[PDB]
Write an enzyme that holds these catalytic residues in place. Structure first.
Site, PDB file in Angstrom:
ATOM      1  N   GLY A  40       0.662  -1.212   0.237  1.00  0.00           N
ATOM      2  CA  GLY A  40       0.021  -0.192   0.076  1.00  0.00           C
ATOM      3  C   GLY A  40       0.807   1.401   0.112  1.00  0.00           C
ATOM      4  CB  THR A  41      -0.300   4.938  -0.607  1.00  0.00           C
ATOM      5  OG1 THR A  41      -0.964   5.308   0.507  1.00  0.00           O
ATOM      6  CG2 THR A  41      -0.992   4.595  -1.797  1.00  0.00           C
ATOM      7  CB  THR A  42       4.286   5.965   2.290  1.00  0.00           C
ATOM      8  OG1 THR A  42       4.957   5.366   1.605  1.00  0.00           O
ATOM      9  CG2 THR A  42       5.104   6.255   3.869  1.00  0.00           C
ATOM     10  CB  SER A  90      -0.548   1.684   4.712  1.00  0.00           C
ATOM     11  OG  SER A  90       0.080   2.937   4.833  1.00  0.00           O
TER      12      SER A  90
END
Ligand SMILES: [Cl-]
Ligand SMILES: [Mg+2]
Lengths: 243, 240, 235, 231, 111, 244, 241, 250, 195
Positions: free
Chosen positions: A29-31, A74
């Protein structure tokens, strides 16, 4: 073998492989980050701009629980939503019975026990998110990070997602260079920088920044989003530091 | 509760549990039904690897559902008791609410419906039973004979057989039964029913059962002596 | 094994696709929609000559203005018809009017996907639902166990369907009379049927606004069969 | 592979294959497009027939006077989800005398889809939805996927060959975003967008489906002779 | 003891012509000897050219009208935007009222 | 989920058989032989214990023969624990009938209901069948003396003489050979023991490896008595027939 | 071998899931130790804080179950907290139902019975933890009772748990050979804590700062944990010896 | 969530064995030896207190448990399974007997109830069999003294004397030699201690041996006086001292 | 409902039951048969709360008919009476009890004896030589106490019944429109057509 096909099965080394596989979805996932400050906490997240067609500012990912708790996560986005919906039920129930808003450590265990419960049976799947959350209660500020296993601790700073290691390193410097403390307005700027710095690990697509914060002095102990002048001011601070 | 879908489709579009239930029926003792001009006869093979039986008390193969309808079967015996009980209860319930006994078609349709239901309900297997259901509708003299099977499909038959070697006796009935002229009397109809069983059975000793059903709840079981007479007469005519 | 509610990698439900195979094994059913009515015809297919063929009920009344023909595992249709009748009668009770043919069809199709680990498997039977209503006139619907229903000017289902459908593609025009449609169904049935078509091994029905849904007697169909042979002999 | 037996199982790389296979049913579905200005939001859908004797499967469903969607994938799943959405729009009206925010409609669909992705015995929904609505904060377009992910967009498209329409809209952004107070022009931009996804076929009178909602226009559907205007 | 009913007064009146119909009602709302409102409408356009009033206990009357308006909405959804005929509306309302046969809506209804 | 570990106890084989019923019958075939013989004036129940140890308390023990009511008893072949579950059910069911009708339960009705319970475990619920076969010996005023057998399939049949458990094939041929319809109880006793003597997997038949019961009209006029033989009584009946 | 995935017997009469749950017990790489004084019961556990970003105060494996009962867990924290919350609830309910404070040994038995169920019932997995319960019981005096994933439990004179448990165990065994008694013959809990830390240092062969340890003390009518400053005082007292 | 295991985990194999019962018995085989001997005026049950560590307090672990004032139990196999069975066995003596008849159940019937519980774990959904065999010794007015063994299958048998677990084959042989129908209680205790020494390897004394009797009534253990028809429990756990006394004269 | 009597003589049971069905101030019917045949040799008369009576009778009839088919055997009068008592004994502690009183007259073919059972709505059963429900008993019991003999013929029993009906027609306030009389003996159930 086949120990990894069913949730809640112990492998011979004593591990639950399904929980470990959920972590892989989190790492994908994104940070997202959280920074504990003097009298509060700051949350920030990387939002990948998939396309020009995404309406800017209009796909909000940070979520408030009650009036005093912020949550960001995330991994699988719907799983995080499911967890926050549960957190909201837990906070409502606590408030209903005990009157006072739920303390953050108390709130952390409520999510912890619920997430952990999803590692007990093969009829459920573990949560596909690591959740950074916290806020301000009668005992001060608290920041927590909670993983698919149900494991959680309190943090000075925390990060998760693709840029977790870049952000961790950047967080360690802040902790080392500010033993006395970091202020809320300061922490908002650092948060922006660290997201921009942790965006190197995710850099085909450019992104949209999103910050929120609870501070006893700056937000009256309530969770508010950072927008307008204060957001742009923090974006600029980050733009400076990458060049 | 136990939930599992046991009856399910396979890639070729077959429901193997229903089809395997049919294999159980194939293994069952033979049963045949023939309808005359004015009667229906149910005949049943009783397998002869069993002596020291007590026939007074052993379950008879033909069962009265109501006083005007009977049911015989081939397949799993314990399964058949469950269907027979339900049908009997439905027969009494129909009399209670409609103030009229069941038609043979209705009672058949009910039993067929139970069987079908067990082919798409969780946690249960299909009935390993096919039934022949025979009798006369209230205040009607036209004879009725229906067949049901594990899938739940049912239909009417001028004459029909089920169970082991039923293909042999169906073959017989197909060339020996004239639609234009059905067995004009009880005597005639019972004879054709015994002849067909004798293609498959053995001696017609403690091996053949016969049940005659006439209109107005007139149902009687034939016994050894009278069946033996039919067996005897059939063989002596056959020596040509 | 593997769950009843599983998707294939192509994005289709295994169990629904397998039930479609069972339907292909079923006896042929044909429907044709005209401005004068809708005709429904089926292949009875007695599995033996001793079976009394008029006990084979594969065309069925749902209400006075709606009829239904089936193909596949026909035992699975009983409860679909039971639901359809209840829905149609219930609608009339709640609203003092005839239920729409489309609404009836949608109601039956809701049952379809209520299976899993509710019933244990999909239905192994497809239905041709035909009827009339004030708003949309004469209609024909093909109701599958996928829960999908399509409106058709004409449609065939069962074993003879791909051949029969291609034939219906040519023969259907928007000005077909009822009589023309009756003959077409008989013609196309005789084409795809294994055994030789007659009044005993095939069955006809129609639904008109004036007289509602009617199954034809074996005498009436016999005359249509005789009439069909004479029109083909004459060219 | 060994991990696609059910929705309750993660793969060793952290993937959910039953959800991904559910996503695949959308890809096989007929194309549909969504786009919006500041005043109106439009759905355009290519409908699919079984053959020349059959009707064209409806792709657009009305949820309220101010909201509705288009579908791509399993139609009965869209019927379930649209029915749920009708109920939620209705609950908001009866209880709060409040038109349901398009954003909340998104959240509720997301949470409904998600529960089927974490529990044993169920299955993910096999359909993708495009939700348009005009609420208290203007025009809106939403993209729903059965993974649970809901996204707010200026425009988009889903279904087979949706990539053509999506790149067109990505190009045309700055033009169509400012088609304010003109219904027919925003629709034309939508029809032009869907045309980028056509192959060996073009838009006919009973093949095309359009829906529009906006400032002073209730959610309404156009089919048949009422779409001839735009071919 | 708690009495779940009340009487909000007012009166309504419906007359049918050859090609029209009227439904009239006063706008007064009362409890006991007090006036609550001098203008509180109780005759409503329910869509599909049906007008409705449920006079007696206002809370029950508002609930019923609210439910019927909702019934019209779902009739459209479930039956392809078909128009609800007045005879079909009447029968639908019978089932709404009789569903509470053992705890009635305290209203005289006219459409 | 859990589907992985489900044995599917209630399905058909491709040959149309019930695996679990078949395997339960295979279990039963290694159990001590039990024999029932019905005479004109009574019934004998005789059964062999699974290889006794000398330190087993022989008189306080009941492994094979059980009293269902005053007029009905059963001989067990299979899992004892399973059989006791079914026996208490049968004991209760007999008492329900007496309470309802103020008449002792007809033997077949009791038999049918136990057999129906067994049947249920083969068709629904996903549980294993009861690994038990019964011989029912009992009297009622409709059919007089009756013998029945039931097995894990829930199928039941009536008998003049029958065996269950080990060596039934051998035992059934011996019974079929020497049984006559006009037989008396004391002749039946003798036949029962002589049959076990020839079919047993032991060196020779002794009192300590046996359970024995009769249902005669042996009391005071037109009323029935059950006699569960004590060890010393079996010892005597073994001598009185010349097997020891 | 699906007999290795759920809690059913293997052919040699074993429950592998229970055995593998014991292996999860050491996943945290922490060692714990418990001893009894005349008046008190002391439990010490290693405190390892690897990441600098953590808030060290929130990192704990000792729990206050009731006013009188304390519990240290050897195992992963999610299962640990799961067991802690349950034990707290069970202790509270006991007081409400029966009108007196739940004894250490009875809570131990109750949690052991709960663990036993997971070894017999298939849908529940065992918790990968070992629970050491400590108190000064009003009837039995100073008490240590320990629970494992098998559902086994027993009282101890003293005990240890963790990867290097055996070293600590024999260290304590040798002391009680020499001392000839059931306990630490000491007046104050402060000196019993000092004993506990001292013998942990010998058996492990390592030195501790104030932040390397975690200490719980049970006296009559309260169980409490020590702060870093209270531990530093204790370490200093040992160093000046 | 919820127990979705509603199906049997014990099923018949093609040979007709019930695997899980067989494997449960194998678990019992591994277990420490325990025994029971039935005298004319009493019953003795005995076992070894095999401690896990010398730091453990083996008095806190009771392998021999009181079920009713005249019934005691001991086991071989898995201890935790035994513990919950004792809990359930105590409660069932009250719920399904004492609360109905106002008196404690006779030995055979309590045994019967325990066996029922164990049979159900062999057939119910989602559970494994209990991994223990019990020896239950007891007295009641109409049956006198008795001793029963209960296996994982739920089967029970009455015994004059027997042993279960580790060294049962040897112990059963030693008991066949020594047992007679004229044994007094003290003689049976003596034989029990002799039979047990065979199987114990390490220390053999009153702290490593657990041993209880069903004997005479103990008014001194009743807790109250004044009702002369109440005479106290027949179950008595012998003290560490009491056992050592009998090992000097062994 | 109202009047139901039963007399057991030497070789039969005779049941007499009034024909009137009244609601308010209207006799709605004067030819009502307040009886159901449970089995070929068992008859049940009934009286009590409107609706409950027929509902209860037909429910019992259905159950006994079901038993007959299942076992291909006729339950004894004693067994049927016990079944009926148990249902009423259940009912009296239900949410809404069956308010029905019955008489069960049967011929037991195994004993070759007639039997008469009186059961009230509470589930109170007694076997009697003669019985009645409701106000009828207040006249008939004493009348039968005098005139009845154990060894009377069916014909003598019918005359004894005429006495009972005559007295009730003389002294009862309501017009019950005569009785339908039915005899139960070794040959089953038949109705006396002129009474
Ligand atoms: Cl407990
Ligand atoms: Mg488990």
């Amino acid at each position: 073998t086949g120990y990894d096909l069913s949730n809640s099965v112990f492998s011979p080394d004593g591990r639950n492989f399904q929980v470990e596989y959920a972590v892989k979805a989190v790492e994908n996932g994104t940070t997202s980050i959280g920074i504990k400050c003097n009298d509060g906490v700051v949350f920030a997240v990387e939002k990948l701009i998939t396309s020009k067609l995404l309406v800017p500012q209009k796909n909000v990912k940070i979520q408030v629980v009650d009036r005093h708790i912020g949550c960001v996560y995330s991994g699988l986005i719907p799983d995080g939503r499911h967890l926050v919906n549960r957190g909201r039920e837990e906070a409502a129930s606590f408030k209903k019975l005990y009157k006072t808003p739920i303390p953050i450590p108390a709130f952390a265990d409520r999510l912890g026990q619920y997430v952990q419960a999803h590692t007990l049976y093969n009829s459920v799947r573990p949560f596909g998110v690591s959740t950074i959350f916290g806020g301000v209660d009668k005992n001060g500020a608290h920041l927590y990070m909670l993983e698919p296993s149900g494991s959680y601790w309190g943090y000075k700073g925390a990060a998760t997602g693709k840029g977790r290691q870049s952000a961790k390193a950047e967080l360690e410097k802040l902790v080392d260079h500010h033993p006395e403390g970091l202020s809320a307005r300061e922490a908002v700027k650092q948060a922006a920088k660290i997201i921009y710095l942790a965006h190197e690990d995710n850099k085909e697509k450019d992104f949209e920044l999103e910050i929120s914060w609870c501070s006893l002095s700056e937000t009256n102990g309530l969770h508010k989003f950072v927008k307008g002048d204060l957001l742009q001011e923090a974006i600029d601070f980050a733009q400076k530091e990458i060049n | 509760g136990y939930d599992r879908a046991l009856s399910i489709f396979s890639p070729d579009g077959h429901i193997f549990q229903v089809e395997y239930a049919l294999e159980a029926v194939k293994r069952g003792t033979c049963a045949v039904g023939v309808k005359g001009k004015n009667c229906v006869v149910l005949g049943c093979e009783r397998r002869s690897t069993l002596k020291l039986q007590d026939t007074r008390i052993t379950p008879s193969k033909v069962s009265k559902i109501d006083s005007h309808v009977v049911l015989s079967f081939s397949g799993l015996n314990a399964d058949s008791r469950i269907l027979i009980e339900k049908a009997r209860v439905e027969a009494q319930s129909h009399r209670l609410t409609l103030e009229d006994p069941v038609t043979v078609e209705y009672l058949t349709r009910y039993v067929a419906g139970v069987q079908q239901r067990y082919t798409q309900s969780g946690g249960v297997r299909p009935f390993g039973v096919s039934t022949l259901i025979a009798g006369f509708d209230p205040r009607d003299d036209e004879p009725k004979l229906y067949q049901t099977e594990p899938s739940g499909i049912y239909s009417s038959w001028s004459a029909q057989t089920i169970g082991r070697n039923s293909k042999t006796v169906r073959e017989f009935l197909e060339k020996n039964y004239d639609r234009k002229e059905p067995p004009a009397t009880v005597e005639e109809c019972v004879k054709l029913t015994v002849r067909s069983l004798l293609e498959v059975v053995q001696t017609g000793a403690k091996n053949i059962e016969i049940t005659v059903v006439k209109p107005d709840s007139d149902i009687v079981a034939l016994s050894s002596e009278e069946i033996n007479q039919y067996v005897t007469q059939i063989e002596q005519e056959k020596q040509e | 094994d593997r769950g009843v509610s599983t998707f294939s990698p192509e994005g289709r439900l295994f169990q629904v696709e397998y039930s479609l195979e069972a339907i292909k094994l079923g006896s042929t059913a044909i429907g044709i929609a005209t401005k004068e009515g809708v005709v429904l015809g089926v292949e009875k297919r007695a599995t033996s000559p001793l079976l009394e063929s008029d006990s084979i009920e594969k065309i069925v009344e749902i209400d006075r203005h709606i009829g239904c023909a089936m193909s596949g595992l026909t035992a699975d249709a009983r409860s679909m018809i039971e639901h359809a009748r209840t829905a149609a009668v219930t609608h009339n009770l709640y609203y003092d009017e005839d239920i729409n043919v489309e609404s009836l069809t949608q109601s039956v199709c809701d049952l379809a996907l209520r299976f899993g680990e509710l019933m244990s498997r999909p239905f192994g039977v497809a239905l041709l639902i035909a009827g009339h209503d004030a708003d949309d006139g004469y209609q024909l619907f093909h109701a599958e166990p996928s829960g999908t229903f399509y409106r058709y000017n004409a449609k065939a289902i069962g074993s003879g369907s791909e051949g029969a459908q291609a034939e219906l593609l040519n023969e259907w025009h928007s000005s077909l009379t009822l009589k023309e449609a009756e003959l077409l169904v008989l013609k196309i049935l005789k084409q795809v049927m294994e055994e030789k078509l007659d009044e005993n091994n095939a069955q006809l029905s129609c639904i008109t606004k004036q007289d509602g849904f009617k199954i034809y007697d074996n005498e009436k169909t016999a005359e249509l069969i005789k009439e069909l042979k004479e029109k083909e002999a004459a060219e | 592979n060994n991990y696609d037996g059910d929705t309750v199982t993660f793969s060793p790389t952290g993937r959910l294959f039953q959800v991904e296979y559910a996503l695949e049913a959308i890809k096989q579905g007929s194309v549909t497009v969504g786009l919006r200005s500041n005043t109106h939001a439009v759905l355009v859908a290519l409908k699919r027939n079984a053959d020349e004797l059959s009707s064209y499967q409806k792709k657009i469903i009305k949820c309220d006077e101010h909201m509705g969607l288009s579908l791509a994938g399993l139609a009965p799943d869209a019927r379930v989800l649209s029915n749920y959405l009708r109920q939620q729009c209705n609950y908001s009206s009866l209880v709060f005398n409040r038109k349901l925010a398009v954003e909340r409609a998104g959240h509720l669909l997301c949470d409904k889809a998600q529960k089927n992705t974490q529990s044993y015995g169920g299955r993910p929904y096999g359909v993708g939805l495009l939700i348009i609505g005009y609420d208290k904060s203007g025009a809106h377009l939403l993209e729903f996927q059965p993974s649970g992910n809901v996204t707010e967009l200026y425009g988009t498209a889903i279904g087979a060959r949706s990539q053509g329409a999506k790149t067109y809209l990505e190009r045309t952004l700055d033009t169509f975003i400012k088609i304010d107070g003109n219904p027919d022009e925003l629709i034309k931009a939508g029809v032009e967008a869907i045309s980028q996804s056509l192959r060996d076929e073009s838009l006919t009178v009973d093949n095309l489906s359009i829906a529009i909602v906006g400032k002073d226009t209730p959610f309404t559907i156009y089919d048949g002779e009422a779409v001839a205007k735009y071919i | 003891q708690f009495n779940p009913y009340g009487d909000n007064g007012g009166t309504i009146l419906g007359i049918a012509g050859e090609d029209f119909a009227v439904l009239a009602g006063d706008t007064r709302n009362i409890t006991d000897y007090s006036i609550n409102s001098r203008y509180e409408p109780k005759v409503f356009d329910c869509g599909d050219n049906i007008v409705m009033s449920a006079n007696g206990f206002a809370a029950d009357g508002d609930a019923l009208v609210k439910r019927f308006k909702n019934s019209v909405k779902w009739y459209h959804f479930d039956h392809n935007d078909k128009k609800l005929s007045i005879n079909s509306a009447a029968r639908n309302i019978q089932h709404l009222l009789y569903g509470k046969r053992f705890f009635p809506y305290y209203v005289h209804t006219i459409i | 989920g859990s589907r992985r570990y489900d044995s599917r106890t209630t399905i058909f084989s491709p040959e149309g058989r019930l695996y679990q019923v078949e395997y339960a019958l295979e279990s039963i075939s290694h159990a001590g032989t039990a024999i029932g013989i019905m005479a004109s004036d009574g019934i004998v129940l005789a059964a062999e214990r699974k290889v006794t140890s000398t330190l087993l308390e022989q008189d306080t023990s009941t492994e094979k023969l059980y009293k269902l009511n005053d007029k009905i008893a059963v001989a067990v072949a299979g899992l004892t624990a399973d059989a006791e579950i079914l026996i208490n059910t049968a004991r209760i069911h007999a008492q329900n009938y007496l309470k309802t009708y103020n008449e002792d339960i007809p033997v077949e009705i009791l038999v049918r209901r136990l057999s129906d319970i067994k049947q249920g475990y083969t068709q629904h619920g996903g549980l294993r069948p009861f690994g038990v076969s019964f011989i029912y010996a009992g009297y009622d005023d409709r059919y007089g003396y009756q013998l029945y057998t039931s097995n894990p399939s829930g199928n039941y049949t009536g008998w003049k003489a029958i065996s269950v458990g080990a060596n039934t094939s051998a035992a059934q041929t011996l019974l079929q050979m020497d049984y006559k319809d006009d037989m008396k109880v004391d002749d039946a006793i003798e036949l029962a023991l002589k049959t076990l003597s020839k079919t047993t997997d032991s060196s020779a038949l002794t009192y300590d490896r046996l359970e024995f019961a009769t249902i005669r009209k042996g009391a005071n006029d037109g009323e029935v008595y059950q006699k569960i033989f004590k060890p010393q009584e079996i010892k005597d009946i073994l001598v009185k027939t010349g097997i020891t | 071998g699906y007999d290795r995935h759920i809690t059913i017997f293997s052919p040699e009469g074993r429950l592998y899931q229970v055995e593998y749950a014991f292996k999860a017990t050491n996943q945290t790489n922490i060692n714990s130790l418990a001893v009894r004084g005349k008046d008190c019961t002391v439990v010490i556990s290693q405190k390892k804080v690897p990441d600098k970003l953590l808030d060290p105060t929130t990192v704990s494996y000792i729990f206050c179950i009731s006013r009188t009962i304390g519990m240290v867990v050897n195992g992963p924290i999610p299962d640990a907290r799961n067991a802690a919350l349950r034990a707290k609830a069970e202790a509270a309910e006991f007081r409400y139902k029966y009108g007196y404070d739940m004894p250490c040994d009875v809570l131990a038995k109750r949690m052991a019975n709960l663990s036993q169920i997971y070894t017999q019932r298939a849908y529940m997995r065992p918790l990968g933890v070992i629970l050491t319960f400590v108190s000064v019981d009003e009837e039995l005096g100073p008490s240590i009772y320990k629970t494992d994933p098998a559902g086994y439990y027993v009282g101890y004179k003293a005990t240890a748990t963790g990867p290097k448990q055996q070293e600590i165990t024999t260290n304590l065994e040798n002391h009680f050979k020499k001392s000839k008694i059931d306990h630490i013959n000491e007046e104050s809990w402060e000196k019993v804590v000092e004993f506990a830390i001292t013998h942990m240092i010998d058996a492990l062969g390592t030195e501790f700062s104030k932040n390397d340890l975690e200490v719980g003390v049970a006296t009559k009518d309260k169980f409490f944990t020590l702060s870093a400053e209270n531990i530093e005082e204790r370490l200093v007292a040992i160093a000046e010896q | 969530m919820t127990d979705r295991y509603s199906f049997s985990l014990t099923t018949f194999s093609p040979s007709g064995k019930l695997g899980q019962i067989d494997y449960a018995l194998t678990a019992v085989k591994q277990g420490v030896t325990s025994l029971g001997i039935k005298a004319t005026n009493g019953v003795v049950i005995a076992t070894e207190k095999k401690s896990s560590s010398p730091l453990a307090m083996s008095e806190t672990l009771s392998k021999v448990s009181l079920l009713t004032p005249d019934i005691g139990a001991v086991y071989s196999g898995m201890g935790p399974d035994y513990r919950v069975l004792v809990d359930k066995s105590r409660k069932v003596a009250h719920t399904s007997y004492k609360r109905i008849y106002g008196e404690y159940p006779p030995t055979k019937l309590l045994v019967s109830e325990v066996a029922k519980i164990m049979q159900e774990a062999t057939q119910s959904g989602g559970v494994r069999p209990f991994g223990v065999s019990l020896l239950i010794a007891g007295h009641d007015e109409f049956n006198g003294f008795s001793l029963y063994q209960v296996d994982p299958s739920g089967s029970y048998f009455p015994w004059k004397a027997t042993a279960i677990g580790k060294g049962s084959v040897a112990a059963k042989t030693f008991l066949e030699k020594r047992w007679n129908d004229e044994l007094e209680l003290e003689d049976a205790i003596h034989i029990a201690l002799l039979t047990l020494k065979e199987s114990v390897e390490g220390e053999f004394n009153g702290d490593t041996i657990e041993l209880a009797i069903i004997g005479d009534e103990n008014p001194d253990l009743l807790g109250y006086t004044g009702i002369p028809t109440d005479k106290g429990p027949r179950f008595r756990k012998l003290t560490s001292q009491e056992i050592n006394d009998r090992l000097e004269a062994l | 409902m109202d009047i139901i009597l039963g007399i057991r003589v030497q070789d039969s049971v005779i049941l007499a039951s009034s024909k009137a069905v009244t609601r308010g101030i209207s006799v709605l019917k004067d030819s009502d048969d307040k009886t159901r045949q449970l089995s070929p040799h068992t008859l049940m008369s009934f009286a009590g709360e409107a609706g409950d009576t027929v509902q209860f009778a037909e429910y019992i009839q259905a159950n006994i008919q079901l038993y007959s088919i299942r076992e291909d055997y006729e339950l004894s009068p004693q067994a049927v009476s016990s079944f009926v008592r148990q249902e009423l004994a259940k009912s009296i502690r239900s949410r809404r009890p069956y308010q029905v009183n019955v008489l069960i007259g049967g011929y037991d073919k195994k004993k070759n004896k007639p039997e008469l059972y009186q059961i009230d709505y509470l589930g109170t059963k007694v076997e009697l030589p003669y019985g009645a429900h409701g106000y009828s008993g207040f006249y008939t019991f004493s009348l039968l106490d005098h005139h009845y003999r154990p060894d009377m013929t069916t014909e003598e029993g019918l005359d004894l019944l005429k006495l009972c009906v005559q007295e009730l027609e003389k002294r009862m306030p309501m017009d019950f429109k005569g009785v339908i009389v039915k005899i139960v003996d070794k040959d089953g159930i038949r109705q006396v057509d002129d009474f």
